[PDB]
Structure 1
Amino acid sequence: APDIPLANVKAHLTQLSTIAANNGGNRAHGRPGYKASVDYVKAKLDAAGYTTTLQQFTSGGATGYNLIANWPGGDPNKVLMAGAHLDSVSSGAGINDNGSGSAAVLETALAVSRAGYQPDKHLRFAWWGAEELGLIGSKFYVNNLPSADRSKLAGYLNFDMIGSPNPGYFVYDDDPVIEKTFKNYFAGLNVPTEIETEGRSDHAPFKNVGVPVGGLFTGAGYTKSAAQAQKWGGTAGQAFDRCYHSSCDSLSNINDTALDRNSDAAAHAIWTLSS
């Protein structure tokens, strides 16, 4: 897999931050900052050669969107998906939650094109709408995915909050092959990981219908323990993300090392699991 350039990931976050500032301070469902986020991500993918689909839904009386990006080629009967919700709460720009996962998934998708990669499995990336309303976009996607296509899914990889400023390194303990792939990457860095327990994100609708899932998380409102600070640094007794769902979830609310490591791990897993 290629090494995902941290600066490119950060640049997507800068664009999402400006989009929020230009649209009332947020990127929330039903508000113009969300569709503008979709338009940014979609244009990058279209230019890179993806076949993109805007999947529209209505929730709360307002139109929502998922952005689906299929990399042409690969076995139609073995589809590997990776995704991240692209909406924020309305209090702020949602840069860690979840610009971080959105940007890492986008830069991984662009990296496939830059590398000239032809995965054996068909790759499909997703940016979900309305996660903050209760997983509404990912539920809509799974609910509208015919059973014959659901059975073609080899896995769904989720990235929701992966740049927390006081990070832990949590790996979902779901499908064993996907979990092993992420843990192996972190082992190569000599960075310990722990099982995610802090769940409720967009892998749940996939998990609940039997699709193998996994993912990465760096912590939210829970406090980092003394033992977690000893293994990962940062500040014991402070939240992993002190700006969770806040107006201060801005460009300053990112740990660059965690963002880099989790972006690189995302690419490692997508390459490994698609051969």
Structure 2
Amino acid sequence: APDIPLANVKAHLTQLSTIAANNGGNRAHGRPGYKASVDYVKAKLDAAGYTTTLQQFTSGGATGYNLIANWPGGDPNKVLMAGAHLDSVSSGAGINDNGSGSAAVLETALAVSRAGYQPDKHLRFAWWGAEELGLIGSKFYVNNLPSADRSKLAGYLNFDMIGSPNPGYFVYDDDPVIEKTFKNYFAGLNVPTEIETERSDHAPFKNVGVPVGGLFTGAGYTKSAAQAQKWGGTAGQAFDRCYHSSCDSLSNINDTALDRNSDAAAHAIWTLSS
């Protein structure tokens, strides 16, 4: 896999930050900052050669969207998916929750195009709407994916909060092959990981038998002494002190965590799509 350029991931975050500022301070479902976020990501994907789909739904009396991006080619009967919710809560820009995963998944999709990668498995990326309403977008997608297509999914990889300011390095303990591939990347960095225990958009996939996995750097729970010894930062402070807050801004990112998890996303997408 290529090394995902941190500066490019950070530049998507800057664009999302400015979209929030331009639209009432947030990127929430049913508010203009969300659709403007979708339009930004979609434009980058279209330019890179993806086939994009806007999947519309209604929730809470407002139109929501999922953005689906299919990379043409690969085995139609073995599809690898990777995704991230693109909405924020209405209190702020949602830069770590979940600009971080949205930006990492977008830059990985652009990196596939830049590398001329032709995976054996067909690649499909997704940006989910209305996760903060209760996984409404990803539930809508799974609920509307025919059983024949669900059976074609080799895996779904989720990235939701991967730049936390006081980070841990958590790997989902779900499908064993997906988990091992993420843990191998971190092993190569000599960065220890822990099993994620602290829901998100992998749940509707997991619950219908699709293999899942993912990366997470912590939210409102407190980093322990033992976790600060292995990863640095501050024991006794939340992993993300601006979780769901107005201060979940461009300042709410640990660049090293964002970089490593973006590089790990690409590592796993390449490995599992071979």
Q: Normalising TM by the smaller chain, what interval? A: over 0.9
SS at match of 1:235: coil
Measured in 2, the distance between the counterparts of 1:147 and 1:33 equals 33
Residue 204 of structure 1, CA deviation: 0.1
In the aligned structure 2, how far is the partner of 1:195 from the partner of 1:141?
Answer: 27
Structure 1: stretches of 5+ with no match in the other structure: none
Using the TM superposition, give the Cα deviation of residue 65 of structure 1 relative to its aligned residue in structure 2, in angstroms. Answer: 0.1
Residue 100 of structure 1 deviates from its aligned partner by: 0.0
- TM superposition shift of 1:34: 0.1
Deviation per residue, 1:82-136 (Å, 9 max, x gap): 0000000000000000000000000000000000000000000000000000000
Residue 58 of structure 1, CA deviation: 0.0
Shift >3 Å, 4+ stretches: none
Q: Counterpart of 1:224 in 2: which secondary structure?
A: coil
Per the alignment, in what secondary structure is the counterpart of residue 248 of structure 1?
coil
Match of 1:22 in 2: 22
1:240-271 CA-to-partner distances (Å, cap 9, x unmatched) read 00000000000000000000000000000000
Q: Provide TM-score, normalisation by structure 1.
A: 1.00
Alpha-carbon deviation of 1:32? 0.1
Deviation at 1:228, TM superposition (A): 0.1
Residues 162-201 of structure 1: pairs in structure 2 closer than 5 A: 162-198=162-198, 200-201=199-200
Shift of 1:9: 0.1
Looking at structure 2, the residues matched to 57 and 6 of structure 1 have their Cα atoms a distance apart, in angstroms, of 33
Residues paired across the two proteins, number: 274
User: How far is 1:13 from its partner?
Assistant: 0.1
Secondary structure in 2 aligned to 1:206? helix
What do residues 122-178 of structure 1 show as CA deviations (whole Å, max 9, x unaligned)?
A: 000000000000000000000000000000000000000000000000000000000
Q: What's the offset of the Cα at 1:44?
A: 0.1
The 3-state SS of whatever aligns with 1:166 is: coil
Counterpart in the other structure of 1:153: 153
Q: Could you tell me how far 1:68 is from its partner in structure 2?
A: 0.1
After the TM superposition, which residues 88-167 of structure 1 pair with which residues of structure 2 at under 5 Å, given as runs? 88-167=88-167
- What root-mean-square deviation, in Å, do the aligned CA atoms of Structure 1 and Structure 2 show? 0.1
SS of match in other structure, 2:73 = coil
Pairs within 5 Å for 1:68-79? 68-79=68-79
Give the CA deviation at 1:225: 0.1
Q: Which digits, 9 at most, give the CA deviation of each residue in 1:32-77, with x for residues without a partner? A: 0000000000000000000000000000000000000000000000
SS of corresponding position for 1:155: strand
Alpha-carbon distance, 1:222 to partner: 0.2
In 2, distance between residues paired with 1:195 and 1:123?
26
User: What SS is found at the alignment partner of 1:269?
Assistant: helix
Instruction: Write the deviation string for residues 186-244 of structure 1: whole angstroms up to 9, x where unpaired.
Output: 0000000000000x000000000000000000000000000000000000000000000
Distance 2:98 2:115 in 1: 26
Q: Give distance in 1, aligned partners of 2:201 and 2:241.
A: 22
State the percentage of identical aligned residues: 100
1:203 correspondence with 2:215:
no
Cα separation, 2, equivalents of 1:105 and 1:256: 16
Which residue in the other structure is 1:46 paired with? Answer: 46
Kindly provide the CA deviation profile for residues 6-46 of structure 1, in whole angstroms up to 9, marking residues without a partner as x: 00000000000000000000000000000000000000000
How far apart in 2 are the matches of 1:104 and 1:78? Answer: 23
**Secondary structure at 1:43 match in 2:** helix
1:221, 1:148 → 2: CA distance?
Answer: 38
